[PDB]
Amino acid sequence: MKDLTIGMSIDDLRLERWQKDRDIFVKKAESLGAKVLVQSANGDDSAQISQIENMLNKNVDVLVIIPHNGDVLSNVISEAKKEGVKVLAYDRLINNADLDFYVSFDNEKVGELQADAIIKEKPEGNYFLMGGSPVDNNAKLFRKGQMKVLQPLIDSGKIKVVGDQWVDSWLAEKALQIMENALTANKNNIDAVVASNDATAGGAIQALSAQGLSGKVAISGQDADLAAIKRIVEGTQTMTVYKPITNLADKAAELSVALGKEEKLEPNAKLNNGLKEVDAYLLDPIVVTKDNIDSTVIKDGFHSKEAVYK
Numbered sequence: 001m002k003d004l005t006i007g008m009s010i011d012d013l014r015l016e017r018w019q020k021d022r023d024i025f026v027k028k029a030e031s032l033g034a035k036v037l038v039q040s041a042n043g044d045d046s047a048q049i050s051q052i053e054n055m056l057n058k059n060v061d062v063l064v065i066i067p068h069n070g071d072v073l074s075n076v077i078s079e080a081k082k083e084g085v086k087v088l089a090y091d092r093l094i095n096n097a098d099l100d101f102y103v104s105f106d107n108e109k110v111g112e113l114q115a116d117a118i119i120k121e122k123p124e125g126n127y128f129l130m131g132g133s134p135v136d137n138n139a140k141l142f143r144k145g146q147m148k149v150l151q152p153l154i155d156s157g158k159i160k161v162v163g164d165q166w167v168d169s170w171l172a173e174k175a176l177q178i179m180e181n182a183l184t185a186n187k188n189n190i191d192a193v194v195a196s197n198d199a200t201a202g203g204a205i206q207a208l209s210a211q212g213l214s215g216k217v218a219i220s221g222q223d224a225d226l227a228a229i230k231r232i233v234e235g236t237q238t239m240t241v242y243k244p245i246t247n248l249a250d251k252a253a254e255l256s257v258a259l260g261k262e263e264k265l266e267p268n269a270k271l272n273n274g275l276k277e278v279d280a281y282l283l284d285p286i287v288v289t290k291d292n293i294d295s296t297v298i299k300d301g302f303h304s305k306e307a308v309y310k
C-alpha cells in the first residue's frame, strides 16, 4: 500500500475556528497513517499559490485547500491535476477549478437560520446586512439564505434595509469601522444587524456599545467563538450558529484518505462551481441561543462550563 501525504493549504489563523480545524484534521489524518504538511497564507493570495506549489513539489497525493480567494486558484489546481494530485476543497468552495470533492456545512441553511432568529427578535424595523468577505463563496451563500427569509418582509414593507456592506477578509476591525459609520449615517436608527460570523458581530458590537446600543440591537453570528457565547450569555449577541468542527475535520480526513486510495466516494450534494458540478458532502448546522448553550456547546465539550461562565 502506497504511503500517503496530504497537503493542507489554509487562509489564515485569525478566526478562532481554523486552529481547531487544522489540529483536529491533522490528528485524524495521522491516525489513518498519512503525513500532513500544513501551510497558512496569512490572507495573501500569491502566498497561498506559492504554498500550494511547494506542496506539489514535495509530491503530495492529496491537496486539502481552504481558499482565501475562491477565484484565484484555478491554474495552480489544474497543474496539480496534471500531476495526478487529488484536490479537496475544505469549507469554502473554489470556483472554476477542477475539484475532486468539497466538504463543508450547509452554508445556505446557516444564512437562513441567522435570519430566522433575527426576524424573530425584531419582526419590524431598520435592518443592516453585514456580509462576509467578498472573495469567499460562503459569504454569498450565507446571504442567499438570509434573503430567502428576509425578502418576504422587505416586500411587505415590515422591514427596511438601510445598509449592506461586505467585510473584507472577515476582519473584525473592518466590521467595527463599517458599523461605526453605519450608526452615524443612520443617526443610530438601526434595530437589527444581520452579521454573517462571530468575529464581525463582535466588531459591530463594540461600535454598538460605544453608542449605548449593545444589548438593544439584534445581531447574528456563527462559529460559536467562546467570546460570542459569553456575549449571548450577557445579552449582547442574539445568536450564533454552531458548526461542530470535529465532525467536519474528521470527515475531511476520511475523505482525503479515500481520494488517495481512489475509493468511490458517497456525496450527499453536488455544487456547480462554474467549470463543473463538484461532488460534495454537507454537514448540518446548529442554532445556539441563550437557552440551549447547555444543550449544545457545553454538551459536546466545544467549550467547558468553566470557560463559559467562570
Ligand SMILES: O[C@@H]1[C@@H](O)[C@H](O)OC[C@H]1O
Binding pocket: 015, 017, 091, 092, 132, 136, 138, 139, 170, 197, 198, 222, 223
Ligand atoms: O469565514 C467563514 C467562517 O467564519 C465560517 O465559520 O465558515 C465559513 C467561512 O467562510
